[model samples]
Target: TGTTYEAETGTTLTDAVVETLYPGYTGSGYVNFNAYTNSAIEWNAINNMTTGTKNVKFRYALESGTRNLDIYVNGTKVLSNEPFTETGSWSTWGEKTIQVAMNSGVNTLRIVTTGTEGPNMDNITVTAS
Candidate 1:
């Protein structure tokens, strides 16, 4: 089983804002990266029972083109320039998963846009692998 975390709840948004313009999103709403470079969303204090690999799933919506973002785990960049491909329309949601090593106790995970506007972020579900 995986633990899901809402992006608009108890998360830090830098150059991002929560919006409900689109539907099919979980929780209160989804986050828009404000179409700016370096737009980021950081989920703080992610609890982990043991220090090991975990699968992180990001639910998002992208209209067209490939948007790139950097994934940081515990302040360290784990994946750079990760490509987020198109998902038909803005109202349509998609998911991207990445495996990362996490420390026991608490961890901070962040996703920052590189140069282009990132996809509309919904939430993240973390599962131990």
Candidate 2:
């Protein structure tokens, strides 16, 4: 058997008109989420891990159009990646997994999209064993 978890938030992704990708989405991409410069543009929720765990696993889906994104923990930038293999439209979503040190409480997760448009993130889950 496998364990599963999820955290999510939604918003429009463009500066002007809302980029219609996910059928029901109505937010702007790269608008600034928690932990980023702006605390408004949000991704999923924090993937909390227990203490004493040196390693934690987190997975989240980002729009394939995501050119680049930065990951943060406890207000500290921890990881940054291209998050895509080839580069799809702003509508496609891809999975990104990161291994990190487990923090005790209230960690922050944010995304910094480097593309012009279509940079939405979602479904964050963390695990430790």
Candidate 3:
């Protein structure tokens, strides 16, 4: 098992709504990704990787329209894809996995969205693979 990080307190959110009411959520809180063309939430992930890569899972929920977002590792653009789907409600949560290489210490990871923005993020879990 890997370490888990909460989205609300673990990441630096720019133009983000930090507290939103929703069901099936811890602390009844979530980070709402801004509905803009290029908004982002950055997380400083502390890791202990000597080499190779790790799989990071993002826990989120999409209340309405589906949207795509960009995933960046240490300021490098890695994934240009959809990070959201219709989860019926904002409270409904889901997780997605992405592979990213990490250094022996802290790494900067970012989730940047398109015009529709990203999802309502709950937490992130990372495991070395």
Candidate 4:
């Protein structure tokens, strides 16, 4: 089973803000990353029961163009220049899934903008395999 984690809760944000300006978000609010390089949102102390490969699904919304962000797991870069494609409108939502190895116990997942601003992030659903 997958567990959903809210982006607005228990996260460290850099050049980002939690806003309810858009609809269709699952949690209290979504995170809007600023239009600057290195803008980040880090989810801290994500708990995993087993040490293995896991599916990480990021829920996001992009108005038009695609934005790239780098994914880091446990302070190590795992996926670089991952694209968050357009979802027609800001009110629309999409999901991007990636598989990465995680350790048992606590882990961290971070997304950092490369150059342009990233899409509005809703939450993440993590499923251990």
Candidate 5:
């Protein structure tokens, strides 16, 4: 089995709301937040890999407009201006996978809006390759 972490399970969230009105989510529930310029979600991941890159999957929902988010790995910008496209409705969800380098031990992962703000986050699943 791989590692699957709920987005709502993040250690902290700025202006975040956790609810279950929408379907297609994992863990306790999903987290939603208003696009406040640069809303953020801070979460953590543990890597057993000696050192390399891993594909990180972000599960989220976009209700209306396409949103943008800057992803950070261990406080470093790994992905900039990543877009979470419209998924028809807020209840509809999508998934995006991006490659990011990882550390041998604990790692801190964060996603911050780059003005347009981010989408409704569902979960984050990591598979070391």
Candidate 6:
């Protein structure tokens, strides 16, 4: 339940609308992120990694028009993205999930905001099973 973000708009929309809708909620450290600039989004520890290969799933709900978003595992690319359609919804927070196998120990799950206006990443999760 969030927005894709706008540098032209800043956090106003999310602060005004989204904050109220989901108040008293503390975003997880792994998923806690905020828009710093137009080209970057908060990746938290979600993208903080050096290596791993444990069957991981990169899940997130997306919202935006730009399509230069990418997920890099351990500073290396794993998800293939391009000038494509927007995935996920703010209502459900961009209903989309990407799966990959990570190596071990620690790894970074990065979302590259490569568009003029970027995407909203609601949830990024990794499960070891």
Candidate 5 lDDT tens digits, 79-99: 889888888787788888888
Model 6 local distance difference test score: 0.39
- Tens-digit lDDT track for model 3 on 32-77? 8776767778888656556558888878888687888888888998
What is the model-wide C-alpha lDDT for candidate 4?
0.92
2 or 4, greater by lDDT:
4
Which prediction has more favorable lDDT, 2 or 6? 2
lDDT of 1 at 90: 92
Model 2 lDDT tens row, 8-96: 33322323222334542222222222232222223333445465333332332243433455555555677665353422533444455
lDDT by candidate, in order shown = 0.92, 0.40, 0.78, 0.92, 0.79, 0.39
Q: Which ten residues in a row have the lowest lDDT in candidate 3?
A: 43-52
RMSDs, each prediction? 0.9, 6.4, 1.8, 0.9, 1.7, 8.3
- In model 6, the Cα lDDT at residue 120 comes to 41
How does each model score on TM-score? 0.96, 0.51, 0.87, 0.96, 0.89, 0.48
Give a tens-digit lDDT track for model 1, residues 35-82: 558889999979998899999998999999999999999999999999
Residue pairs whose backbone atoms clash in candidate 5: none
User: What local lDDT does model 3 show for residue 118?
Assistant: 80
Clashes of each: 0, 10, 0, 0, 0, 18
Q: Write model 4 residue lDDT over 1-129, tens digit each, in one string.
A: 988999989899999999999999997999999856898999997899999999999999999998999999999999999888899899999998999999989999999999978999999999996
- Model 5 accuracy (lDDT, Cα): 0.79
How many pairs in model 6 have backbone atoms within 3 A of each other, for residues 3 or more apart or on separate chains, i.e. clashes? 18
lDDT for position 111 in model 4:
95
lDDT of 6 at 30: 17
